[PDB]
Design a protein around this ligand. Structure first.
Ligand SMILES: *[C@@H]1O[C@H](CO[C@@H]2O[C@@H](C)[C@@H](O)[C@@H](O)[C@@H]2O)[C@@H](O[C@@H]2O[C@H](CO)[C@@H](O[C@@H]3O[C@H](CO[C@H]4O[C@H](CO)[C@@H](O)[C@H](O)[C@@H]4O[C@@H]4O[C@H](CO)[C@@H](O)[C@H](O)[C@H]4NC(C)=O)[C@@H](O)[C@H](O[C@H]4O[C@H](CO)[C@@H](O)[C@H](O)[C@@H]4O)[C@@H]3O)[C@H](O)[C@H]2NC(C)=O)[C@H](O)[C@H]1NC(C)=O
Ligand SMILES: OC[C@H]1O[C@@](CO)(O[C@H]2O[C@H](CO)[C@@H](O)[C@H](O)[C@H]2O)[C@@H](O)[C@@H]1O
Ligand SMILES: OC[C@H]1O[C@@](CO)(O[C@H]2O[C@H](CO)[C@@H](O)[C@H](O)[C@H]2O)[C@@H](O)[C@@H]1O
Ligand SMILES: OC[C@H]1O[C@@](CO)(O[C@H]2O[C@H](CO)[C@@H](O)[C@H](O)[C@H]2O)[C@@H](O)[C@@H]1O
Lengths: 218, 438, 441, 218
């Protein structure tokens, strides 16, 4: 049972830069003159695509800019010069022994100037409130990098384990991220409190931005 | 061309079974292994097993030995993967991928994937709820609106805005699997806040597994049955009469603009003296006046002689909330000046029975109506006096009355009182007339 | 629990027939006669006939004998009135009513009535149109909304609001008959302005002859899909007169109090503007804002009364502007019946220095009056004069007004001892009239 | 037949006053110790209600303030202390003979203090404008006395022949009236004009009240 560690988990570069992805095997994968390690590219919603096989030989149909190097336990996949089509996840795989295992992946993301999030808050709709549940939605729009902390507060009291976040993929045109946070409460628990707010922390913000509303005042 | 075509979407209950097919074409099926790899949502790749079509020889991952059956049909060049005793964490996209039998050169061709959902739910269509600002009045130019597509099963849902017409600013988030085992997603769109009651915003949600289509109106145009809940204006103020008549005092023309929008807080002032532009006006910074509006003031100083010889003081105001520009003009009242006549009148005999008495000053025959009237006692200014506005007489001139209220004792003990008038037609713009107990 | 339930609205053609049923319950059916009475449009009550349910004996009004049949059904305790060979003038409301068999003690219980229309005109269901204000204004405390139920035939139509839940302030008007021969009716409801956008308002219209049942939405909530336009509906202003309760003495100092509530936490800054007879005043005591307690803010402004202003009937106007909202909320109060102040009239001869001129001024000082509404005229030897001018009223220091009126006369006329009079018309004078004379001494 | 002559036709009184209604039969309606003469109360939209039977017996459930008297040919209904809810038409009826016949009625109206109307104007709905007619409505709410005048002006032009009014029956609690006037125009004529005004004249209003709207500002 051989395991593969990839590094860095996330690589943030500009189109034109070089990408050097690393893969480390717990035991040696080279046997009889060949290193049984391969690389794959994965775009969202698509199957993985073979790039390099046996850690070096280029796969038919794959661009010249992709190359692989390594033997033993340390392997490198290089992308001499990135293109917009190269921003994707990259996986390493061994086959010197069964079971076959993959590395955890390395996401190659587009580098960009820091943009603060345009934050918006939405109360639960009247239509929903008649159903017994209440969803309060906080939107963090067109920001970069992906790291951003959303804290939900009800009457200045911190909330925990009653929220769920979802994030978009990096936008094709402006290379930005958008995030949604939903605080779910029952109608009884929602009717008990009055003030609802989502505080947002991000590299682009000099001080936490907090958008809020009052239950009755709508 | 090498092609691996997999069977469609699968939705199963836990404890059930699933059989996925992978139709191979464009190559010698028996010269390649067929492998099975899965990917759980937002996770990495997990190799399950492999089959050698030429002999049926199978290799597996310990976690999948006993639950997976791998089979092949060489006539139909099809590989099958049967996963038995399904568990919630078998939810993934399952891929087939081939591999050269003689020399291992990786998984060079993959199928498109087959999504398998393992759940106790129960196909269900979404409840679509609107996402709108609680109080989008604000001073910000961009508003966000959306649709919360909650409690549906299984995936996927598709969201459009205005039947495909609205594409810019849209962000449809990936679905979230809730504790209930029902999915939920939000779709949002940033639009200009000006458009809100001018344009319609509708999200079109389609959930094909339940054959549900919902066109939810999140924001309509203004008008009934919706409950009910005009650009900048300019005022130009002339100098004070005393300030134009006294050389010690300073006269000013004040231009104020009100009803300025919060989104358009411009401070563009242009001043003209007799049609010729000037630049000596001291403009003040803008201020929010407890309304949803801004107010800003510009003050142009004027020479005493310029105001007195007429001279038109024009104030042009510019702002991006106007179709054109507002221009107001002011000047001294036109017409031939006429000199005031000033007369003092003692209290009525009948008013002498009261504790306080009235001292009267009649000012008649003056033109224009700009005048200042004051009272003095002995050698100092008075306070308890009121002057009437100027009244137009039948001869084209104005008159007024000024009234000083005094304690009868002050009048009775012989104090001298003076009514002083400042008007442009008077010599040195000033005259004074005295009143004393006779 | 005596009940007589009649069948529903009917419309029939002339020459046809109508059968009205009357279902009896809560009593011994056979111990009461059943009578039929009609009420034609613009008419009184007309007896048609009666039946004895125990044996079927009948009596009829001779005017209908030959066209009316009375029948009973003992198993369903129902009485029927059938009127055949219908005439246009048989259009009426028809009633059943019971009468004790053994003693005549009147028609003690009646059915609800059946509207019957005889017409060869076609039945038409109404169009229902909402009545909503063209952009409601402030500070209107009451709003009206309604429904126009237009172009239907025959009568009647029923209207309810919010499925019968809303009854207070409702006026459903009698129908009007248009020149087309079709009816129209209007139903309205008055509600607090504060309630618009809080609750939905819907009129429920039923026209049973055409099977029309419409639920027309007149007013919605604030309230996607309605654009947002601040929230809560808006802050509320309450302007109190001088009182309050409990005790004495010189503290005291009567005050008009302006109190504002439903002021949000995101828009707390409030400004108060005070007007006495539309003249801005600046002596008010604006108390510091307080959170207490629900969630909103409460800000109080106290204006001290001056002179005899409240008793005179002066108007105290409080205008509240919240920092963040588009408009200003204005409230006005005053004493119902004010006590006016009487004008004092004084005549002044020409200044000695004006006596060197060809024309001299006769002056009339009028002071100490309230309200400002007044008129001055002049006369010479009792005859109304031609060339005089009066100033507008000027507000004095004591809360009353004063003015001057000036009459120009030839010096010769003053010198020859003619009597000039200043005449004043005002609410606070005996016979709303007084004059003061002036002559060369 | 017996003719029952009722008088007065109308009676306008303040609450707390005694009302005296008379019924004179053309022939005697008394026989063997009984007078076959009954009294009813009919309120707007309801069936007649029996008050008194056999000239002077009070019907169960009817308040004691109602009483009947007389014999032979002359009968009287008395309401000793009028209430606002006593607004109705009162009828007498005999059963001495066939045909049974009713008197012509006495209408009892309630007097109250002068109440000026509150006026409201309503523009035509966009829904109605899809057809080719425009209805403009004016409401005069809760006023006393009944006399009120409405004048319609379209761009200051006095309207005639294209208006209809309805007045409610006197209210049973406050004793006021309400009036709805409708100005009917073709959509073409409605769209050619700008200001629509409803002018109201009433005793409670020293000066008339005008409510207006400008078409297009709705
Ligand atoms: C939102 O708020 C704005 C700011 O107002 C302040 O804040 C609000 C929230 C309230 O608290 C207010 O009480 C407060 O004042 C509003 O601004 C006002 O807009 C109106 C337009 O609708 C302006 O009205 C015009 O006023 C002229 C006279 O103005 C002088 O006198 C006023 C007192 O009587 C005084 O308040 C003014 O400041 C001004 O005072 C003079 O200022 C100059 C320069 O500093 C000095 O040199 C003089 O000495 C001052 N004189 C005195 C006596 O103090 C009118 O002449 C004018 O009328 C003419 O035009 C109209 C048509 O436009 C004709 O109908 C009329 O017949 C005549 O020809 C007009 O009434 C008002 O001045 C504005 N106030 C200020 C402070 O500038 C916004 O309107 C408001 N927005 C909305 C939508 O509500
Ligand atoms: O889909 C299974 C997968 O989802 C997880 C993590 O999000 O949670 C869901 O799993 C079940 C779905 O029917 C529910 O029992 C559970 O409440 C829900 O959150 C994991 O349990 C699992 O890996
Ligand atoms: O009319 C000549 C001349 O007299 C004055 C006073 O000096 O005006 C007086 O006569 C006028 C005509 O009757 C009046 O209108 C005026 O009120 C009165 O003082 C001059 O002003 C005028 O030029
Ligand atoms: O001054 C001439 C003439 O003007 C009128 C207009 O009707 O109004 C003036 O006098 C009134 C008192 O009589 C004042 O209330 C008013 O303000 C003033 O302009 C006439 O009344 C007067 O004869």
């Amino acid at each position: 049972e051989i395991v593969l560690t990839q590094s860095p988990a996330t690589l943030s570069l500009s189109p034109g830069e070089r990408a050097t992805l690393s893969c480390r095997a717990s035991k040696g994968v080279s046997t009889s003159g060949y290193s049984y390690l391969h690389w794959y590219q994965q775009k969202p919603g698509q199957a993985p695509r073979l790039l390099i096989y046996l850690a070096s030989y280029l796969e038919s149909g794959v661009p010249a800019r992709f190359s692989g190097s390594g033997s033993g336990t340390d392997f490198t996949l290089t992308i001499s010069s990135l293109e917009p089509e190269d921003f994707a996840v990259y996986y390493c795989q061994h086959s010197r022994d069964l079971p076959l295992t993959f590395g955890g992946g390395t996401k190659v993301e587009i580098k960009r100037t820091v943009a603060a999030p345009s934050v918006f808050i939405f109360p639960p709709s009247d239509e929903q409130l008649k159903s017994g549940t209440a969803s309060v939605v906080c939107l963090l729009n067109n920001f970069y990098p992906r790291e951003a902390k959303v804290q939900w507060k009800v009457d200045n009291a911190l909330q925990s384990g009653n929220s769920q976040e979802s994030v978009t993929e990096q936008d094709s045109k402006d290379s930005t991220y958008s995030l949604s946070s939903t605080l779910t409460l029952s109608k009884a628990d929602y009717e008990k409190h009055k003030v609802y707010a989502c505080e947002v922390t991000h590299q682009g913000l000099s001080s936490p931005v907090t958008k809020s509303f009052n239950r009755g005042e709508c | 061309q090498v092609q691996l075509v997999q069977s469609g979407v699968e939705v199963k209950k836990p404890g059930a079974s699933v059989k996925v097919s992978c139709k191979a074409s464009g190559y010698t099926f028996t010269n390649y292994y067929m492998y099975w790899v899965r990917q759980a949502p937002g996770q990495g790749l997990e190799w399950m097993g492999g089959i050698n079509p030429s002999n049926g020889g199978t290799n597996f991952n310990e976690k999948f030995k006993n639950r997976v059956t791998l089979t092949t049909d060489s006539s139909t060049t099809t590989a099958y993967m049967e996963l038995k005793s399904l568990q919630f964490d078998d939810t993934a996209v399952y891929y087939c991928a081939r591999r050269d039998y003689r020399f291992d050169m990786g998984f060079d061709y993959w199928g498109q994937g087959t999504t398998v959902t393992v759940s106790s739910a129960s196909t269900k269509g979404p409840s679509v709820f609107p996402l709108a600002p609680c109080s989008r009045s604000t001073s910000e130019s961009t508003a966000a609106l959306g649709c919360l597509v909650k409690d549906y099963f299984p995936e996927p849902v598709t969201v459009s805005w205005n039947s495909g017409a609205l594409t810019s600013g849209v962000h449809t988030f990936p679905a979230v699997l809730q504790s209930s085992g029902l999915y939920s997603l939000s779709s949002v769109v940033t639009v200009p806040s000006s458009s809100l009651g001018t344009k319609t915003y509708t999200c079109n949600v389609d959930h094909k597994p339940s054959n549900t289509k919902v066109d939810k109106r999140v924001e309509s145009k203004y008008g009934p049955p919706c409950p009910p809940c005009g650009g900048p204006s300019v005022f130009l103020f002339p100098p004070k009469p005393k300030d134009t008549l006294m050389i010690s005092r300073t006269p000013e023309v004040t231009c104020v603009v009100v009803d300025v929008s919060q989104e358009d807080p411009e401070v563009q002032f242009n001043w003209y003296v007799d049609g010729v532009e000037v630049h000596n006006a001291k403009t003040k910074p803008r201020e929010e006046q407890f309304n949803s509006t801004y107010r800003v003031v510009s003050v142009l100083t004027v020479l005493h002689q310029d105001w007195l010889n007429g001279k038109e003081y024009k104030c042009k105001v510019s702002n991006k909330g106007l179709p054109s520009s507002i221009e107001k003009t002011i000047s001294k009242a036109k017409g031939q000046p006429r000199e005031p006549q000033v007369y003092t009148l003692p209290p009525s005999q009948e008013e002498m029975t009261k504790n306080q008495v009235s001292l009267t000053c009649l000012v008649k025959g003056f033109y224009p109506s700009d005048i200042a009237v004051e009272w003095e006692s002995n050698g100092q200014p008075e306070n308890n006096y009121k002057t009437t506005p100027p009244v137009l007489d039948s001869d084209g001139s104005f008159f007024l009355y000024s009234r000083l209220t005094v304690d009868k004792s002050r009048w009775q003990q012989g104090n001298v009182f003076s009514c002083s008038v400042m008007h442009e037609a008077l010599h040195n713009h000033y005259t004074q007339k005295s009143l004393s107990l006779s």
